Amino acid sequence: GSEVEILKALLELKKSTAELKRATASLRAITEELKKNPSEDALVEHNRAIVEHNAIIVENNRIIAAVLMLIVVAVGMTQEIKKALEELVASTAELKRATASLRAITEELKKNPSEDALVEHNRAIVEHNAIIVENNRIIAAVLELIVRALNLTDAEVIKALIELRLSTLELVAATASLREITEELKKNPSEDALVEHNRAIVEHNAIIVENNRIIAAVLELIVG
Amino acid sequence: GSEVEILKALLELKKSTAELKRATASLRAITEELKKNPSEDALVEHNRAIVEHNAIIVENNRIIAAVLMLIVVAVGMTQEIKKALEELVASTAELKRATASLRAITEELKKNPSEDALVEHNRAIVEHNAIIVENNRIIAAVLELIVRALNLTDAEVIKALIELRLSTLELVAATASLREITEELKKNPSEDALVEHNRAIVEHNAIIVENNRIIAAVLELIVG
Amino acid sequence: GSEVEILKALLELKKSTAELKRATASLRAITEELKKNPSEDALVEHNRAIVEHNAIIVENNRIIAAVLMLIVVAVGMTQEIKKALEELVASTAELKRATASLRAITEELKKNPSEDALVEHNRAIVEHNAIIVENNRIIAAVLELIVRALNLTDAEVIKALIELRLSTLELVAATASLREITEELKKNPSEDALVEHNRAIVEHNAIIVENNRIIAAVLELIVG
Amino acid sequence: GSEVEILKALLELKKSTAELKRATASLRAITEELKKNPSEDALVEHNRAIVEHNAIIVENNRIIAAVLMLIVVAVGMTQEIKKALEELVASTAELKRATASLRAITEELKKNPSEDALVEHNRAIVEHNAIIVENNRIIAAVLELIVRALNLTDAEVIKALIELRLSTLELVAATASLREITEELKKNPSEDALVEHNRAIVEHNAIIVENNRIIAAVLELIVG
């Protein structure tokens, strides 16, 4: 793909440079030879027009190449985006499996409220949060790939990406804390440990909500 | 390149759709089963949070896919752009050759102002204008490819492209008229035919200037 | 066709320009000669009226040429449209043949439900979808030709065309995926492969429906 | 040009009609044969999707042909427009010659105010008005050609054209009256005849101004 397109852009720069050098040489040959006898009006006026036309063409070639380099840089990220998508697809499928599992657990817990079903409920919630964390990590990575691929410079998007990175650090640390709390609850289940675990979950969900808010802000800036 | 990236985007849409269907099924199973006994607070609150998280993830996947499709469409034009560049490079090289030829003719005409050298001058000028016309046709084509590749909707760029197309029609018709006038001058050279030819050249150059102005306006709109 | 009409428009521009230059020259000759003796009222008032009349005529010629250039640009696409129509006609005829084949297969399959008839049914469905994809590609191309020929600038039509291009990319990728799934079913037919294939068909039809919706929106915008 | 494009549109209508007939035949064969055994779900659902796809394609072909017929009708007027332009160009050139003649007369009359120069002045003014009348007749004709070529239905443009036709009748009658007055002045020149002639000129110019106002209104409606 871009391996050849870029080689052609380089060939274009070489040819427009050679054109510029030759057009400049005629510019000067014209001034020096025609000033000798201004009565040769057609020759000097035609050659000056030729020089202006070439100068414009060279400037246009420079601008066109400058734009195509942006298309080329977007093209060169095809494999990075493809891999980010493969990860996002696997994450989505895992999230779906966790949701179906949780639904089945909910039905079993309500129909037959065995303590084991409550344990399975909390386990499913922890798996779901781990999946959300992986999903948001993958999305943040794909957002960075999109921002880079589109060559965005908007200060608002850069700041939003910084906020996203910080919120993903907070989300990962909170996730690790939630997993440790769940394991401690499992080892020594109790009413106090269970209420502390439920509080840890509420705080974790609040963090996820903030992370999703930031992701939404980044997407809004990219789309709009 | 885009052949696989797009297949992955379609796979993502399939998976986010399956996730949405499953998240919806749990949304309803939760509401209907939990209203039976609101005292199971942890189960209903955790599952509602789960549903909100999935709904957000599905919406984000939709938006991300929508953006990546714009990158994919830009990527899919790689071969069209490569061919447009090959044409532009060949045109640039031909323009350079015409310029070098004209410079050599100018030097020969000034050093030895034979009538044959004036004839060669007018021939070189006509070849140069034919080259500009081919060059601007190629640039207009690459500009359309750029506008399509970047998915631009700005009304100003669309109008500028329309003006460009019209000016390229005017330029081609004027070029054909100039070639016919040159052939008539060559067949029956005279002072009156020569002055009419020089006027034809001035009008042609004015048309080229307008065509380049429009191209510059289009590039300004694309870059800025 | 347009080759001569445009040459005439250029001749008109040349003549209205010469008229403008001469009308301006009399404008000034009038001011300078008549201010010498304002008592020559009839001469100055008549010549001023003459100048205003010419200025109006020059402006009208400019506007008329500007409109006719839009008619000329629409005319110049005659061969591109003719070729797009030839493709659309061939596509329509092929779609008809596929439909008649499918009808005959349906009758044979219901009258004698041999497994081979089911295989032929799925083959006919795949051919039909391939035909729809070619038909919609051709229509999208003719829509672009119509939009360009009519010099439309409506932001809504430009956006609809962008959506169309993206949906045609999705449609082509889905079609390739459907063909591959059908080939895999043919090589290893089974109940699970057959149900997966039928699901692939349902998803493909949903994509076709969306592509047709976008095409309909574009046609609505062109007609209305 | 349009001779072939229109034949292709007719071929398209023939082929889309045949498609419609076959799609309808399968629609009915499907309903009647499948109701015999609704358990053949894949066959009935696939064929119903096939029928919907064909119905949509047929409606789209009808709409596309309806638009292309408007392009074809615009194309078919190429020779009428070309001839209107040839007339407008000849009119412009004649107007330029009259203007240059009037300028030379003005210079001669001011430099050497011979009675013969005043006679030539009034003659040149009458010729100029005759030229304006021919120019506006030609413009009104080209406006009618443009309105027909663009298939405009706007009530405002139709009314403006009616007003134009009426004003051109007034302009022609006034022109004939001015010519008769000029001939009477020439045969029996006098101060009273000269002042009556000058009044006739003022009234004629007022009529020309109104005719140009209407033409401008028509152009405004066509462009906007």
Author numbering:
A (entry chain C), B (entry chain E), C (entry chain Z), D (entry chain L): 1 to 224
Quote what the paper states about this structure:
Here we describe the de novo design of pH-responsive protein filaments built from subunits containing six or nine buried histidine residues that assemble into micrometre-scale, well-ordered fibres at neutral pH. We then applied the filament design method described in Shen et al. to dock these connected monomers into a wide variety of helical filament arrangements and design the amino acid residues at the newly formed interfaces to drive assembly.
All 18 designs were well expressed and soluble. Two designs (DpHF7 and DpHF18) were found to form filaments, as seen in negative stain electron microscopy (EM) images. We used cryogenic EM (cryo-EM) to determine the structures of DpHF7 and DpHF18 at high resolution. The resulting overall architecture can be viewed as a right-handed helix composed of two identical, parallel strands with contacting subunits. In contrast with the near-perfect agreement of the DpHF19 design model and the cryo-EM structure, the structure of DpHF7 differs considerably from the corresponding design model. The pH transition is thus reversible, and the pH transition midpoint can be increased by increasing the number of buried histidines. DpHF7 also has a reversible pH response, with disassembly at pH 4 and reassembly at pH 8.
